[PDB]
Structure formats: structure tokens, C-alpha cells
GROMACS .gro file of N, CA and C in nm:
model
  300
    1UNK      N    1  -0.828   0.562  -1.500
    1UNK     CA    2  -0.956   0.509  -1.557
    1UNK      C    3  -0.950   0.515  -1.709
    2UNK      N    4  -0.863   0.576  -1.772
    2UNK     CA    5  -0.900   0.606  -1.887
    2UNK      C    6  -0.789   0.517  -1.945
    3UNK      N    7  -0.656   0.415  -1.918
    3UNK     CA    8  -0.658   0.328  -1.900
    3UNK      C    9  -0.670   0.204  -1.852
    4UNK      N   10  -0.697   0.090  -1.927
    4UNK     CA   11  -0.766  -0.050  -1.874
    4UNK      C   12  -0.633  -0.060  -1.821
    5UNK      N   13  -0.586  -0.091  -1.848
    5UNK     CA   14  -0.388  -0.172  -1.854
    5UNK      C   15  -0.307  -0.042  -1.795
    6UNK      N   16  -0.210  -0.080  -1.706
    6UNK     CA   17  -0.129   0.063  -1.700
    6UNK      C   18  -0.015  -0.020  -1.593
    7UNK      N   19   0.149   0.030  -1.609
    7UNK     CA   20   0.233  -0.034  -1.554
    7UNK      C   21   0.223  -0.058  -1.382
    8UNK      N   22   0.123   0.057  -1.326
    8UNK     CA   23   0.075   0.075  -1.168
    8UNK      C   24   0.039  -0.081  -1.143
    9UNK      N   25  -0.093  -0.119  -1.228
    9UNK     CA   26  -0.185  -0.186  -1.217
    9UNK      C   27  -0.094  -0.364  -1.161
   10UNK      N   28  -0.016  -0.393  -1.265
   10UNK     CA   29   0.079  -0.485  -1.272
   10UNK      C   30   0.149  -0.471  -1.153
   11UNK      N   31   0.228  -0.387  -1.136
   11UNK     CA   32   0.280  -0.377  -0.959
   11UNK      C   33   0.247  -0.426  -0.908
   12UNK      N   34   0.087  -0.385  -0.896
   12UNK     CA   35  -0.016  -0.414  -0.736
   12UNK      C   36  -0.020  -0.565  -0.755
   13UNK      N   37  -0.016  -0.634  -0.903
   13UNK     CA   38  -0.077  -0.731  -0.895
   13UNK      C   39   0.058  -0.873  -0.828
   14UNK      N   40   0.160  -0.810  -0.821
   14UNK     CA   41   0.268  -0.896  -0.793
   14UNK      C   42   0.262  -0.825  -0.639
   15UNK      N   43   0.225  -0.757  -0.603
   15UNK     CA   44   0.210  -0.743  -0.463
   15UNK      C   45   0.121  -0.786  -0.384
   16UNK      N   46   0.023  -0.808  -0.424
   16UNK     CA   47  -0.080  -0.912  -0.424
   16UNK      C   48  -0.070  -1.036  -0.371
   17UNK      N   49  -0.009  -1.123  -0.433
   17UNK     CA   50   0.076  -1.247  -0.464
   17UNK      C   51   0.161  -1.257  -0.376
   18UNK      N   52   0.283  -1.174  -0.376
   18UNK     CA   53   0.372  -1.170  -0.300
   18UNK      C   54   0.372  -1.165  -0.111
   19UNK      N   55   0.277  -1.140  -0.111
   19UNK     CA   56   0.264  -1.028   0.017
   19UNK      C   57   0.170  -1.172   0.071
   20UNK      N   58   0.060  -1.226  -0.042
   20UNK     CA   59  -0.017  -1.306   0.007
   20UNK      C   60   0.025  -1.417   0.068
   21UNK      N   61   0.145  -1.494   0.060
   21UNK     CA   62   0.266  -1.540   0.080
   21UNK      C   63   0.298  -1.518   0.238
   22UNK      N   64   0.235  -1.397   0.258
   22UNK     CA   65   0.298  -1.339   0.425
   22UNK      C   66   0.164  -1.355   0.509
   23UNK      N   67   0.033  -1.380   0.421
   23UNK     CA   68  -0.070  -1.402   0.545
   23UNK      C   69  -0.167  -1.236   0.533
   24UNK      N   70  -0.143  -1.211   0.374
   24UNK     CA   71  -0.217  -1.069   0.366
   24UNK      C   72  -0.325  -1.151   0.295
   25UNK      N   73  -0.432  -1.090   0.332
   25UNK     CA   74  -0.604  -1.141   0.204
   25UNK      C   75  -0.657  -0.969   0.134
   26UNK      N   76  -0.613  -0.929   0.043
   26UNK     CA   77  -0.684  -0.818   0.027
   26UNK      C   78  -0.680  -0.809  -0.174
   27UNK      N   79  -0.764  -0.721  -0.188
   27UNK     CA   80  -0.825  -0.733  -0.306
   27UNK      C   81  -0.758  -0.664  -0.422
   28UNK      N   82  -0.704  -0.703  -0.550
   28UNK     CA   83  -0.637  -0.637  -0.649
   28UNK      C   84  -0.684  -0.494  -0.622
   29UNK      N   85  -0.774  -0.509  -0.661
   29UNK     CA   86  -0.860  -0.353  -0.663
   29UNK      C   87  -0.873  -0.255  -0.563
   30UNK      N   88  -0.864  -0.296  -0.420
   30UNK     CA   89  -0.873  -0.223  -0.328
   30UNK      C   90  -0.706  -0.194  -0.301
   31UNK      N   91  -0.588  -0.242  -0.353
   31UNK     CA   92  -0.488  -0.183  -0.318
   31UNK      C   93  -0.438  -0.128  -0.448
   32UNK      N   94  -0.523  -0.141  -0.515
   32UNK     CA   95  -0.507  -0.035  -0.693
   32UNK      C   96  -0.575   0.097  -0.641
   33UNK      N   97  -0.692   0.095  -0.561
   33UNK     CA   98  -0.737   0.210  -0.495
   33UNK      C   99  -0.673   0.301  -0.407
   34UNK      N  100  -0.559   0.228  -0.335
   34UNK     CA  101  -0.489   0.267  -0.214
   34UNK      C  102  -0.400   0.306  -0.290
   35UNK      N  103  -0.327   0.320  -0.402
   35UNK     CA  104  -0.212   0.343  -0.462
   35UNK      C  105  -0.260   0.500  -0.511
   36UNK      N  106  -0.348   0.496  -0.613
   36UNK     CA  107  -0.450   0.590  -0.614
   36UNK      C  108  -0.458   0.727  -0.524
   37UNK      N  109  -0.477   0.670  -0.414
   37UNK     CA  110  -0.552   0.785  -0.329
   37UNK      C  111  -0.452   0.848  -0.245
   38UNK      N  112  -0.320   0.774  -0.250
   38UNK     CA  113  -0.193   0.883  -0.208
   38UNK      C  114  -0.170   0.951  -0.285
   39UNK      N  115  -0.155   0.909  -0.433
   39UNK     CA  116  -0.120   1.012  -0.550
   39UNK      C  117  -0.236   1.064  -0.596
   40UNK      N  118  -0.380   1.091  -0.552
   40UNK     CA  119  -0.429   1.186  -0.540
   40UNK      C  120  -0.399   1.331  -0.487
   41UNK      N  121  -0.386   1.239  -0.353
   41UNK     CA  122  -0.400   1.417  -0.260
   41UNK      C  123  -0.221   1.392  -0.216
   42UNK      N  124  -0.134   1.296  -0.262
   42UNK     CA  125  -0.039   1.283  -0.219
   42UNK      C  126   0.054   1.221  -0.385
   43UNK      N  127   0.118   1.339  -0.454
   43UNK     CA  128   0.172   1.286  -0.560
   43UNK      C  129   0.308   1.215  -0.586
   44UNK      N  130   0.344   1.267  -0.414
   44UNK     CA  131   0.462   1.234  -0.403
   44UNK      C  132   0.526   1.102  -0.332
   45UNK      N  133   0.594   1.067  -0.310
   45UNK     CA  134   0.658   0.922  -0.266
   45UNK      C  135   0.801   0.880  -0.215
   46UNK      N  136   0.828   1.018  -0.120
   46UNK     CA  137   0.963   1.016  -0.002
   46UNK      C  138   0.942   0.832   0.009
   47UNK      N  139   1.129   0.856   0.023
   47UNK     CA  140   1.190   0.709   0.017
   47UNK      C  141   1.324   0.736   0.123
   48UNK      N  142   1.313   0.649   0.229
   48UNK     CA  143   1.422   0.627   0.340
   48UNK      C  144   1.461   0.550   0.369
   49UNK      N  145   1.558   0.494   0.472
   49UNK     CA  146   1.574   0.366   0.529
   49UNK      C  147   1.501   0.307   0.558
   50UNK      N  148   1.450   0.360   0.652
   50UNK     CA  149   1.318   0.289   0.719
   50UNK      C  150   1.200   0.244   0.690
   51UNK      N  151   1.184   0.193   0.712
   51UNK     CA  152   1.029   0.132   0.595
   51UNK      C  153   0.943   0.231   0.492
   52UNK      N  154   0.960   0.264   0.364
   52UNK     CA  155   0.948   0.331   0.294
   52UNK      C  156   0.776   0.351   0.324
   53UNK      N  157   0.729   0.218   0.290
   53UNK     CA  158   0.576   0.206   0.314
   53UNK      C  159   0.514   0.249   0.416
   54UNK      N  160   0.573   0.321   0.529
   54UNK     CA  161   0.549   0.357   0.640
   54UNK      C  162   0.447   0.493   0.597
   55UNK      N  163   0.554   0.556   0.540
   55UNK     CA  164   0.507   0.724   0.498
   55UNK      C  165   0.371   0.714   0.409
   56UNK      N  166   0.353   0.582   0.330
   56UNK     CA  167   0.289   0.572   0.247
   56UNK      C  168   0.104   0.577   0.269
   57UNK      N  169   0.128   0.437   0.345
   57UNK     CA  170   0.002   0.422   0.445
   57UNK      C  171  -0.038   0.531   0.563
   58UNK      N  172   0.101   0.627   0.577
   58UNK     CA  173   0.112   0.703   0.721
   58UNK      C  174  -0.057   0.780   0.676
   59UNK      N  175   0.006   0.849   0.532
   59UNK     CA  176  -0.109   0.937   0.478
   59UNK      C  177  -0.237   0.878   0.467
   60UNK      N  178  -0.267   0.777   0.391
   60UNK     CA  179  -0.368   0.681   0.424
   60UNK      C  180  -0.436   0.723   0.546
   61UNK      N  181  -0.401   0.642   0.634
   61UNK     CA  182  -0.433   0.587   0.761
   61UNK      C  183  -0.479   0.716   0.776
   62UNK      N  184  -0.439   0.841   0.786
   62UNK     CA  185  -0.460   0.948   0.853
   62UNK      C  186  -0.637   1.010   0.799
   63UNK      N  187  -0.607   1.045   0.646
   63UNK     CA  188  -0.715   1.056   0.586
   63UNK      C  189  -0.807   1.031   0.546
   64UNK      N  190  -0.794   0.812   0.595
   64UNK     CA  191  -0.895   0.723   0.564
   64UNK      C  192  -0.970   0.722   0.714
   65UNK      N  193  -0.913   0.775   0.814
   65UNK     CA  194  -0.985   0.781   0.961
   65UNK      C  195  -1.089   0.895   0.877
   66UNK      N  196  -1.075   1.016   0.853
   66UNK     CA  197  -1.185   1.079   0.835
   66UNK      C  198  -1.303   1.006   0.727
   67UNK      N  199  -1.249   0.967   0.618
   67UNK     CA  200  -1.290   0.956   0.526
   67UNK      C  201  -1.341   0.835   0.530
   68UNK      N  202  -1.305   0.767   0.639
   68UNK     CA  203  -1.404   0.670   0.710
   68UNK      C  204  -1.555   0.710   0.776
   69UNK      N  205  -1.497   0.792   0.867
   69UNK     CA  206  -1.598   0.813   0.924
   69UNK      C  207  -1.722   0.930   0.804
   70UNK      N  208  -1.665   0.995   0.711
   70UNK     CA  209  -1.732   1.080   0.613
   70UNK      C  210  -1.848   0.959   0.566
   71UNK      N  211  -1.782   0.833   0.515
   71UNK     CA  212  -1.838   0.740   0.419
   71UNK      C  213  -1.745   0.690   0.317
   72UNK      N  214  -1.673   0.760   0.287
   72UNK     CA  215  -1.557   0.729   0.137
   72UNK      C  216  -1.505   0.605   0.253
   73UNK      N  217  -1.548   0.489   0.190
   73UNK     CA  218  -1.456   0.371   0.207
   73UNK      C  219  -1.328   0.321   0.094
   74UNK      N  220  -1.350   0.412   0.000
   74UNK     CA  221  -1.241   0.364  -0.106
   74UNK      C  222  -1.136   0.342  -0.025
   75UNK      N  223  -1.081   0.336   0.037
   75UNK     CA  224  -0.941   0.324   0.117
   75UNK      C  225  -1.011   0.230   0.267
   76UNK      N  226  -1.023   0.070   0.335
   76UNK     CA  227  -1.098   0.022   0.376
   76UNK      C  228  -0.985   0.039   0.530
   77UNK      N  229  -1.004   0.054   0.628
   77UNK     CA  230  -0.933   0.046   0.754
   77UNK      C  231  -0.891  -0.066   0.750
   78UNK      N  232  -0.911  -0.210   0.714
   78UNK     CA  233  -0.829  -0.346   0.678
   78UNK      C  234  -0.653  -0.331   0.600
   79UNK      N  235  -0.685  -0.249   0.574
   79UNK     CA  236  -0.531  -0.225   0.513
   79UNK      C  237  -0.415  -0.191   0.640
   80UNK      N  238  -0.443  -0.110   0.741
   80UNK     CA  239  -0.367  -0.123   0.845
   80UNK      C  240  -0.300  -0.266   0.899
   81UNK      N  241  -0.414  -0.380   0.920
   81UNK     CA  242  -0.403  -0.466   0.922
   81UNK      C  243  -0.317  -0.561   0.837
   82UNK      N  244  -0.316  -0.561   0.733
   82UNK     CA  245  -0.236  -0.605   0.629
   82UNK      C  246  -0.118  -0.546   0.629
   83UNK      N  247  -0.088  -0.409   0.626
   83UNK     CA  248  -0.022  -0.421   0.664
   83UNK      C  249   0.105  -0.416   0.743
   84UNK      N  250   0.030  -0.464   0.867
   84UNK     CA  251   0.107  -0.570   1.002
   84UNK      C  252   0.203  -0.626   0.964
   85UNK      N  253   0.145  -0.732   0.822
   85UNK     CA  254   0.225  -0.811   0.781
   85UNK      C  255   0.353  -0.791   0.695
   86UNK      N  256   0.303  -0.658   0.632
   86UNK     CA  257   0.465  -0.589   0.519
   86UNK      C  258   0.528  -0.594   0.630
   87UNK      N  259   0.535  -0.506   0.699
   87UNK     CA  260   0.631  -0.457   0.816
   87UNK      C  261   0.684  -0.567   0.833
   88UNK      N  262   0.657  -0.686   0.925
   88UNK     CA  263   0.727  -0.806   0.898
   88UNK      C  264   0.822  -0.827   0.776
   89UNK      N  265   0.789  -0.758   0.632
   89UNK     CA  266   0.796  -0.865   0.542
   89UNK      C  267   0.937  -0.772   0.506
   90UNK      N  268   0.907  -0.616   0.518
   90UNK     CA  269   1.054  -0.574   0.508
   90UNK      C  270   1.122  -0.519   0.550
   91UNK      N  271   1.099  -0.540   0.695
   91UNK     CA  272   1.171  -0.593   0.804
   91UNK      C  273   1.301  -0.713   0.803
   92UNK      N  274   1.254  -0.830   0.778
   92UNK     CA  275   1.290  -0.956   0.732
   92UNK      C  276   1.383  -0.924   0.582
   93UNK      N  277   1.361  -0.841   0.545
   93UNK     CA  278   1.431  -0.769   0.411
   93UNK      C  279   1.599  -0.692   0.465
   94UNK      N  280   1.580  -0.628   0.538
   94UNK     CA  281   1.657  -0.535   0.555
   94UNK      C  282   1.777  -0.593   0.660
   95UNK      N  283   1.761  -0.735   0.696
   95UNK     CA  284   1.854  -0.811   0.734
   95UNK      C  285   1.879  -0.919   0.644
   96UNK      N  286   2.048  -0.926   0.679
   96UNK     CA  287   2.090  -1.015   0.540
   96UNK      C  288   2.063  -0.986   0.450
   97UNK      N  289   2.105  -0.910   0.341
   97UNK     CA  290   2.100  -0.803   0.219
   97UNK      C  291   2.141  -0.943   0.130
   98UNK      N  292   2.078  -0.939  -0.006
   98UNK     CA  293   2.075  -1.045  -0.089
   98UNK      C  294   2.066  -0.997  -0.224
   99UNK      N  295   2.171  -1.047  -0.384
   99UNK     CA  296   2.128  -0.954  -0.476
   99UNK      C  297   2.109  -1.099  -0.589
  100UNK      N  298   2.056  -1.056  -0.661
  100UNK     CA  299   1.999  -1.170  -0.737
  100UNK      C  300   1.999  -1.123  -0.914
   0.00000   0.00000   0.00000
């Protein structure tokens, strides 16, 4: 918050874009929130073969069930949904390796 601009922010916003491409609809801001709220209570960011984003959302998903039901919607249960569609997307990644 205490920057407007910050290199996070830019990420999300090509992920955004990118992802939208795959049939995702979700909001700059609400996955600037979701980025957020792992490195809140989660600062860290284990990286594996397997779908990295897995672990990512794992935490999410887990803490946004309560924090659903609490009221804190900052983190919206639609994001599961969305993404449905990463998984597809790097999935589709991890065959046929490509360098550019």
C-alpha cells in the first residue's frame, strides 16, 4: 500500500492478460489481493515440478474456506475456478519444452 507501482503489481497484470487468453475473467485487483494474502500469512513460495501454483492456491483455498465463511472475502472462492484453467495452461506447458 505504501507503494502505488511495485514490480508484484506488473506480474499480476501480464497474468491477467495472459491467462485471459485461457478463458479466466478475474480482476487485476483481486489477484493483486491473492498474491498478497499468501505472503501474508505465507512468505514463502516452494517451487517443484509439479504445478508450482498448486501449493500456492493450496494455502488460499484452505484459509479462504474459513475466511469465507468468517466474512474476509479478500480472497473470493472464484479463484478456484480460474484456476481450472492455469492447470490446463501449465499443464500444456510442461509438454514440448520450448525456449525463446
Amino acid at each position: 500500500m505504501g507503494q502505488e507501482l511495485s514490480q508484484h503489481e506488473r506480474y499480476v497484470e501480464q497474468l491477467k492478460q495472459a491467462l485471459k487468453t485461457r478463458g479466466v475473467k478475474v480482476k487485476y485487483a483481486d489477484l493483486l489481493k491473492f498474491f498478497d494474502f499468501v505472503k501474508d500469512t505465507c512468505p514463502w513460495f516452494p517451487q517443484e515440478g509439479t504445478i508450482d501454483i498448486k501449493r500456492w492456491r493450496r494455502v488460499g483455498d484452505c484459509f479462504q474456506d474459513y475466511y469465507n465463511t468468517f466474512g474476509p472475502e479478500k480472497v473470493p472462492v472464484t479463484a478456484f475456478s480460474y484456476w481450472n484453467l492455469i492447470k490446463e495452461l501449465i499443464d500444456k506447458k510442461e509438454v514440448n519444452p520450448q525456449v525463446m
